[PDB]
Structures are given as C-alpha cells and as structure tokens.
Design a protein around this ligand. Structure first.
Ligand SMILES: COc1cc2c(NC3CCN(C(C)C)CC3)nc(C3CCCCC3)nc2cc1OCCCN1CCCC1
Ligand SMILES: COc1cc2c(NC3CCN(C(C)C)CC3)nc(C3CCCCC3)nc2cc1OCCCN1CCCC1
Ligand SMILES: Nc1ncnc2c1ncn2[C@@H]1O[C@H](CSCC[C@H](N)C(=O)O)[C@@H](O)[C@H]1O
Ligand SMILES: Nc1ncnc2c1ncn2[C@@H]1O[C@H](CSCC[C@H](N)C(=O)O)[C@@H](O)[C@H]1O
Ligand SMILES: [Zn+2]
Ligand SMILES: [Zn+2]
Ligand SMILES: [Zn+2]
Ligand SMILES: [Zn+2]
Ligand SMILES: [Zn+2]
Ligand SMILES: [Zn+2]
Ligand SMILES: [Zn+2]
Ligand SMILES: [Zn+2]
Lengths: 268, 270
C-alpha cells in the first residue's frame, strides 16, 4: 500500500507543499541532498547584481502593451492574461525571457513576472516502477503553465569536469562565451527528481529576473502540452546524456528513442 | 488618500500615502525598493557553506538552536515580538535561520525575513515634512520594517552631497544610502522621545560587513502615532548648523530652544 513519507520535501520554502509518497518499495524519502528553493553558490561567481545595469521598462500599466521594454527584450512578452506561454511560443528553439525587475516602474503584480512568483501547481514526489523517484502532477495542468525552476549549485565548467556524479548537471551555454553549470546533486529542489521522457511534457526556458548577468540564466520548466492528473513530468535530457550513459531509457513511450530496443535497431 | 501603495505591491501590505497639511504630492524623487541594492561590485559573501546554521527538527523554540545561540538567545517570543529583557540601549546581533538550517521556513527565528506585517501610512507632518505613522495599535517589540537603501562604501559616503539618508554600518565601515533608492523607512523622522529601535540582523548571508537594519517597536504604539528613532548626536552635530528638531517633545534635546539654553549655560560658566 502507498504511504506519505514526507508532508513537504521543501520544508515550507515553496508556495505549496511538495509531499513524498512511495507505493512501490520500502525506500524512504530521499535525504542524500539539501533542498533549496533558490540557486546557491559554493565559490564566488561574481554575478552582476548592479541595479543600474538592469534594463527595465517605464510602464505605468500592467506591462500588457507592445511598448514594455522587458517584453521587447524577450522579442514580445510570451505570457497571456493567466501567465501561460502563448501557443506561438517556439518550443524547439525558445527565446530568453526578461521578466520585469526591481528597476521597472511597474507593480510587483504586472503581467511579466511569472517565474519570479514561484510554484503554483500541485506536485508530488513519488516512487516510479523502473526510474526511481519521479515527479507527477496532482492536478490538471494546461499547456504553457510554469511548473518549477531547475534549482541547484552554481559551478564552473572546470568544476563540473572534476565532479564524479554528473546525473544532475544542467548546462548554461551562451552565444559565444563562458560555460557554467547548475549541479542539483548536493543542493537542489523538486526539479532534481524530474526524469527523462522520450515524449516530454515540459520544456526548459532561460529566464532573467532580479539580475541580467547573461552567464547565469535561470531555468524555468513550462508545460509543453495539457498534462492530466497523476501524469509524470519529464523533459528531454538531450542526446549528450544518452551518449554518456550504463542504463537504458525506461520511459516506456511508443516513440522511445533511447530504449535498448531502439539502441539495438540504430546499431543494426 | 493620494497614493494607494508607495511600494507598488512589493510589500506584504500596501503602504498608502496621504496629505492633509499642504499641496505637496506624494514623493517621487527616489526609487522605491523592498530590498537593499548595489551600484558597485560589493560581492556579498553568499557562499552557502559559509553559513552558520542549526540542526533543529522542531520550530527553533529551544535553547539548543545554534542560530538562537549566535544571537546570545533567540530574542523572539511565540508571536515574533522581541522579549522585554532585550537590551534596547546596546542591542545584540540577530542571526535568523537561513536556507542552510534543517528547520522549516515558518520556524520561530525568521521574523525580519518574513517582512512588514503592521499597517503603516506615509503622511505629511506639520513641521518635519513626510513621516510614517501607525494605522493600527503596535505592541512593544513588534518588527515594523527594514532600513532599505543602496549599499555604498565609506569612501563613497564621503563623496555624496546629500547625507540626510545615510545609515552607518560600523563593525571597514559601509553605508545604506536611502536617498536615490530606498523603502518606507526613508521617511521615518527623528524623535527625541523615540518609539522604534534599529537592530542589526543576519538572514540569507552572514557577511558581517553588511548587517541589515530592522526597526522594532521600543514600546506600545497607539493608532495614528508617528514612528521615529533617535538619529544620534552625530546627525544633529552635522545638521544643526542648517535646521533644528521639530519633534515637539517636552524632553527634546535638539530644538532651537534646547540649543540656545546650552550655549547660554556655557557663556554663564566660561
Ligand atoms: C550525462 O549527464 C550530463 C553530463 C554532463 C557532463 N559530463 C561531464 C564529463 C566529464 N566528467 C569528468 C568527471 C571526467 C564530469 C561530467 N558535462 C557537462 C558540462 C559540459 C561543458 C563542459 C563542462 C561539463 N554537462 C553535463 C550535462 C549532463 O546532463 C545533460 C542535461 C541533462 N541533465 C540531466 C539531469 C539534469 C539535466
Ligand atoms: C548627518 O547625517 C548623517 C551623515 C553621515 C555622514 N556624513 C558625511 C560627512 C562628510 N561628507 C562629505 C561631503 C565630506 C559626506 C557626508 N557620514 C557618515 C559616514 C561616517 C563614517 C565614514 C563614512 C561616512 N554617516 C552619516 C550618518 C548620518 O546620519 C546618521 C543616522 C541618521 N540617519 C538619518 C536618516 C537615516 C539615519
Ligand atoms: N527515462 C529514464 N530511464 C531510466 N532512468 C532514468 C530515466 N530518467 C531518469 N532516470 C534516472 O534518473 C537520473 C537523473 S535525475 C532524476 C531523478 C532520479 N530518478 C532519482 O530517483 O533521484 C538518471 O541518471 C537515472 O538514474
Ligand atoms: N525631528 C526632526 N525635526 C526636523 N526635521 C526632521 C526631523 N526628523 C526628520 N527631519 C527631516 O527629515 C530628514 C531625514 S529623512 C526623514 C524623511 C523626511 N521627513 C522627508 O520628508 O523626506 C531630516 O534631514 C530633516 O529634513
Ligand atoms: Zn513594462
Ligand atoms: Zn512589469
Ligand atoms: Zn519591466
Ligand atoms: Zn525513452
Ligand atoms: Zn534552530
Ligand atoms: Zn529555524
Ligand atoms: Zn537556524
Ligand atoms: Zn526633538
């Protein structure tokens, strides 16, 4: 039978509790990491936090106009009235989102402040059948809804290359510059338990909020379609992960590109 | 009511602005910010491994909370008010719980980080310009607001024309300048009979160069009563050559009447 291992893995740091359940085996709630709601540093990253370096808008409205400088920096503001990404949003090659900040003239509740307002959907940490821990939806989630942020430890490329466990690295590669990582192995949030799906229902987006240091985008997961209740969330880890990894994909999708069956067909 | 919220929704509560004295509109010669900002490379030590934290599995109400111990004892009661025994003359540093603690976000040692809870008003006074008054009764030791401004160096503070909004952070001295960037606390006037006290607090970082200033009530504050702290003699030694105190207290130490009595006491002596 299924039991509640923990009422809130986030210890009240989120807008909503993120409980933990297991109805598959006798493995307890994971405790081999530190839950953090916001990205942390373990060495000086010299993030540019200078308020005068912030590009901002002069909006006296709710930032719903074509004239919002912040919306313009993002090509257009991609959020609708309810905070969901527009259907026209490029899901394959997504643009950078520049949310409003503390230097804008607008209010804290303007239409360009979705990711900075945190988690709004009901999520659950649960034990899967062949992928260990996973994250599923406790409610129906419409397409373009913000889910959560890929929160971890901000580390350099030189540091990522010295780490034994690389199963929690998110790459932050820019146009023509530096390489920085988010490692969610020692420090991370709920997104560290999101598994790979060959048919994914969430997409990662590079977002800027309180700072605009281009070497440090924050990763926001948005639904890439309508998600049913109980449905497991997942994004494509990329071919680099499957080229690196010892274990085959257990997503079980009919359109699975990284199963042992699919791998053996490609080699043949 | 001239403005519904001077904080543009950045606070837990709206901070409205009123004027029933003159024709001056609500102030717009500054940028409202809910949190301290930087205008130069400050590099506040934000390394999570450098954080002193507790191992509390409870709500941090015990004598065993390391964070409470760093603060001598946790000075907050069940309701988040400072204990009566709290040294109001020479206050200790408060080390609130942080993201490295094992406790929950709603533990008993997280008062200042949970922001403004009292209903405040920005209003026009009779002889002190803009001031901040209470729209509710406030019990002693209640957290009011933070002295939010721009984080600047001593060398920078010495190069600034307007020094009427500087808060000193001495331990290498740093300042909070609330002239260009600031919050509601930038309108808190000086009172010779003060009802609020400043306290140095540490929360998400423990870079001792940058304590955050928290204002707590020093006594029970009636509704409508203007909030104010003692700016210190250093301010009145600077600013007396230009203006005198208008707090109107019977125990006023910086009124033109008090200044003229001291100069007459010295001329009678030597
Ligand atoms: C297979 O998993 C990844 C391995 C990665 C990896 N491997 C290095 C190889 C050298 N190795 C040394 C001990 C010899 C250290 C580890 N390196 C890097 C950056 C790349 C730029 C240069 C610095 C390092 N990123 C990775 C990202 C990976 O995940 C990809 C995204 C999907 N993740 C899954 C969970 C969250 C999102
Ligand atoms: C009169 O107000 C103050 C003036 C100050 C002041 N003045 C300097 C003098 C030199 N001057 C140069 C043109 C030569 C530049 C300005 N300097 C400093 C520090 C001292 C240590 C080294 C850096 C500078 N602190 C001050 C604090 C003050 O307020 C005290 C508290 C009350 N405030 C009221 C609002 C909120 C709290
Ligand atoms: N589609 C998939 N097939 C098999 N294993 C998967 C998978 N997706 C994720 N995993 C597992 O999850 C790791 C990435 S982090 C995901 C959280 C993890 N399942 C946990 O229990 O902590 C992968 O390295 C692998 O161990
Ligand atoms: N007790 C007092 N007597 C006379 N002026 C005062 C005062 N307390 C504060 N002030 C005024 O307030 C300044 C500090 S900032 C306080 C906010 C200010 N009253 C405003 O309208 O913006 C002082 O330099 C002085 O201009
Ligand atoms: Zn705008
Ligand atoms: Zn806006
Ligand atoms: Zn904006
Ligand atoms: Zn698969
Ligand atoms: Zn504790
Ligand atoms: Zn605590
Ligand atoms: Zn603590
Ligand atoms: Zn006075």
């Amino acid at each position: 039978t299924e039991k509640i291992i923990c009422r809130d893995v986030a210890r009240g740091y989120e807008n909503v509790p993120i409980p933990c359940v297991n109805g598959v085996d006798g493995e307890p709630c994971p405790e081999d990491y530190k839950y953090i709601s916001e990205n942390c540093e373990t060495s000086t990253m010299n993030i540019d936090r200078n308020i005068t370096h912030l590009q901002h808008c002069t909006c006296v409205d709710d930032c719903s106009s074509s004239n919002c400088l912040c919306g313009q920096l993002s090509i257009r503001c991609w959020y609708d009235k309810d905070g969901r990404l527009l259907q026209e949003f490029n899901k394959i090659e997504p643009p950078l989102i520049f949310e409003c900040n503390q230097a804008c003239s607008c209010w804290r509740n303007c239409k360009n402040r979705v990711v900075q307002s945190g988690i709004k959907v009901r999520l659950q940490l649960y034990r899967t059948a062949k992928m260990g821990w996973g994250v599923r939806a406790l409610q129906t989630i419409p397409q373009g809804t913000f889910i959560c942020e890929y929160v971890g430890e901000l580390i350099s490329d030189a540091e990522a290359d010295v780490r034994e466990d690389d199963s929690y690295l998110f790459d932050l590669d820019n146009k023509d510059g530096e390489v920085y990582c988010i490692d969610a192995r020692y420090y991370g949030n709920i997104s560290r338990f999101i598994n790979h799906l060959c048919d994914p229902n969430i997409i990662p987006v590079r977002v800027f909020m309180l700072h605009q240091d281009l070497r440090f985008p924050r990763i926001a997961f948005f639904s890439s379609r309508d998600i049913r209740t109980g449905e497991e969330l997942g994004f494509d880890y990329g071919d680099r992960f499957w080229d690196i990894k010892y274990f085959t994909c257990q997503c079980g999708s009919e359109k699975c590109k990284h199963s042992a069956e699919a791998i053996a067909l490609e080699q043949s």
